[model samples]
Target: HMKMRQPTPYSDSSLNNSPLAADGSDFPCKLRDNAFVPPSQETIAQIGEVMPLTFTGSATHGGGSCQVSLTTDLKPSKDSKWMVIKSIEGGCPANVDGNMSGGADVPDPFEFNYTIPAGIEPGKYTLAWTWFNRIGNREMYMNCAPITVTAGFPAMFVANIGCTTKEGVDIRFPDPGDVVEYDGNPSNLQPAC
Candidate 1:
């Protein structure tokens, strides 16, 4: 009885507009709204724990790229600062092989997994998930969830495997296109976190 997960709740019409539009060229897509206040969930975790994220939806436009990030800014109106915790170049929700056109009555969900950076300080922070489609219109998808990082029992050095970006330009634009083609190797498709 598996069910298809919907796109992240944070996604909106703003993604359909310029910069992210098929005709636009603004990279990073950094638009936000103060009115869209989402209920903060208490996701308690340690500083070096691996966090798992899954999505249920059409996964439209086939497979592409996705990222998991964190920000300390409580009021991210027009823009907020974010740090990359994980970046997937290829094989995001689904790989190039499992692309779906997506339907209303679908019953499958996409899963993404990431780790919490040890460099982060313990506090309540906003976790953001972003997706860039690989097949159809050049668009960006984003979702934010509330999380509380508690002190861990044991300390471990979080691997510095991913990248991070500044607030404004990080999520703004220059769309990554349909396919980033990152398979176990490093490429420009991976953001400069």
Candidate 2:
């Protein structure tokens, strides 16, 4: 929904110091109320191999906070088109204080790290994280799907010839080649874009 900008003058604990809710207040902010994992969606190569997307949940309140963003479009209205990959202004908060047990009600697992920008376009993409609760209210978590970029060029075939008289037409290529240009393997060759 494109709304990730609350990482300033906070003191940083990820952004809000949460043992769930220290004195913060608590509104729609549960720090990470009902959460899940495995959903950053990636594909790299612009430079090398890059993958970083970790998330843990559960928080009645403990001083926890973390932030991350990325959206190509996922049920976002109001011209929805979110994009902010990462942000850490306040800091520390996510069941805060870390390592819990049973009584004090421990479950503050907070972790945030993201990076995957290589060649680009592969397929699906959408990852989000927002936690800010000093009694203010701001909790937004996201996880989309699809992300495949084994490189590029999977289709490209351009032939323009104005000479037909001899009899020469041979086309047989497809072992892992429906189309490819450069980088190695598959070939039909044709890539300037």
Candidate 3:
């Protein structure tokens, strides 16, 4: 699994604000729900060229930990190829107060960087974020809206001829004298080898 850590405090807000901070004053010091907030579709597509998708959001446990997985189907019922894009073992502390305050701040906001394939087909895709418990168990934290790859153009197909036939043995040839007849025209017919 590709492991990711909370980003180190870059700004003052990042220091004391938990995701709870509207302006980020008591930033990392606050406690938050153990969940993920997916990046916007525009945000994700903008960095398609980038190798990994980075997620900068808050979590509360102590040093909030999480991971990202890409699955072909969103509501997967079985163990179908779930590629781990990101993972973070537990470090953050969960809230104990009934008010849900004063928990460890994610050192760095969680970030996920994904390398999309070169020839991605135009369709919908899904991302599943998993939050880890202190014991290393996982629980789904968040799921984003279905992502699409559309070029605003329709797909097209081309064909050469309506129908083709062989000489006398033409598979789809019309019956003799039926409407347009061959009339034994040598040019229209080829001798059987």
Candidate 4:
């Protein structure tokens, strides 16, 4: 499990080492309470700003797949349309072959760069980072941050939240929007929810 290091995730410290709950109670971002405590300093970026998505923790479950999605909804709900802005099919947050050492931070933390798309309506937005590990128990790691360059109406992908589970292979989001990057490791389809 890794912790988002950019944009200042909501309640970033709360769900650091845990995955999404199995019952789906914390589907959007851990729990409803997190949205209440807005980011100390909201991240404001230009439409074409290039941002780096980095994380902490060495439990890089084989460097799984991850998505950088955004929505105008300040307080995201289950029905919130989380538009996937950038999708990393494999070797996301980390670029490892099959797992890494646990308990300590990796000296070289992986960085995934994403260029903020153009045409997004300015104002408040919620940015989400969701991942599905490639070599661990079926799980979904998600963390949201307060940001602004966003859009959408696509239901973000969910895994290991009871109805679906993903493992062994990096998940290729059913609806991965437009921008997609790969790192040699091919992605597998997500099971039906």
Candidate 5:
């Protein structure tokens, strides 16, 4: 049930895209059935402010790790180069406690706030959300959305940025035992990037 917040574009495997069969197992590292489809639409965010991302579906995978990234390439092919913007280890989005369950009855969606950096060139970009679940078959979750970044606005300086995993890291089977408990902190997991 995890989904994108700010941009409304549906993931290739989202129910909105496939009414008959929607699979959440889609990952960005490998090519999928609908990976080459053009973006549905675009979203706009200014520099310097925090762009909030929320999820409506169940994130019940024992809270492994998540990352937000961007790429200038619009093609959905596997060769696209994505630049990491933020990485969340040992927890779910919005800094919420992991391993929890929620549905439509829940008050609000799970949120993740991303601060747009000032140094990013203003242009059309594709944003990717990648997740590594703690439980189940070591599957990877991914969603992409188109965005337009504007300039001439207040911006913040970002330094010492790090990514949790490198390209094709999620494709490796038998994942490392770094899943965080419901009440446990995820600060100890090392970055594979």
Candidate 6:
């Protein structure tokens, strides 16, 4: 499991990446009962700031596809609509063939960079990092933070977090409208691959 360390999460660190449930209860950002408010605490960025997607965790799940999305909601709920900012096809945090392990923390964590898209409406937003591992159980790994985009797609992509369940491949986003980097070996989500 992985955790976001760039913008900083809402609560403390050392949290587990519990493969979000498919019921959608944990769709946006899990670990909260409305008490974990993020208004008073948020990262401030300019219109076109380049932010890092730094991660610190025990596994990269073989380094699969990851998308950086944003929503204007300061407190994202199940109905919040996230817009894709950058899609790291197959080289997102990590692009390996098997599960990456380093005991309780990845010896070499991933730190990718992506720009805050220019045409966004300047306001508070909840930035999210969603992952679809290539070599793990059909699950989705996600972590979010409250970021006030000084400026920010298409709606965010959905895999195991919803009706779809992809595995055994670094499934490419069906509509990565703003793709950034790739490893030239990503595949689309399929029922049986």
TM-score to native of every candidate shown: 0.59, 0.22, 0.33, 0.85, 0.63, 0.84
Question: Highest lDDT: which candidate?
Answer: 4
For model 6, the stretches where C-alpha displacement exceeds 4 angstroms are 39-41, 106-108, 183-193
Could you report the Cα RMSD, in angstroms, for every candidate shown? 9.6, 21.4, 26.5, 3.3, 8.8, 3.2
Clashing residue pairs for model 4: none
Ranking by TM-score: 4, 6, 5, 1, 3, 2
**lDDT tens digits, residues 78-178, model 5?**
45666666655555543344445565324234556776576678898877766655544444556677778887421111111232333222121122222
lDDT of each: 0.47, 0.30, 0.29, 0.73, 0.50, 0.70
Candidate 3 residues lying further than 4 Å off, grouped into runs, are 1-47, 50-59, 89-123, 135-145, 149-193
lDDT of 1 by residue, 38-157 (tens): 454346768777666765555444455566667775444335667776666655656534346555335445565666766778997766666655554445565566667887911111
* Residues 1-193 of candidate 2: C-alpha lDDT, one tens digit per residue: 1112221111112333232233323312223322222234333323233444433333323232233434444332224354443343322233233233443323334443444445345454444444332222333222332233344311111111121111111112122122111211122121110
Model 4 accuracy (lDDT, Cα): 0.73
Which of the numbered candidates is closest to the native, going by highest TM-score?
4
Model 3, C-alpha of 77: deviation from truth (Å): 2.8
Which portions of model 5 show Cα errors greater than 4 Å? Answer: 11-42, 94-99, 103-108, 153-193
Give residue 10's error in model 3 in angstroms. 31
Q: Is candidate 3 or candidate 4 better by TM-score?
A: 4
Q: Using TM-score as the measure, name the better of candidate 3 and candidate 6.
A: 6
Candidate 3's TM-score: 0.33
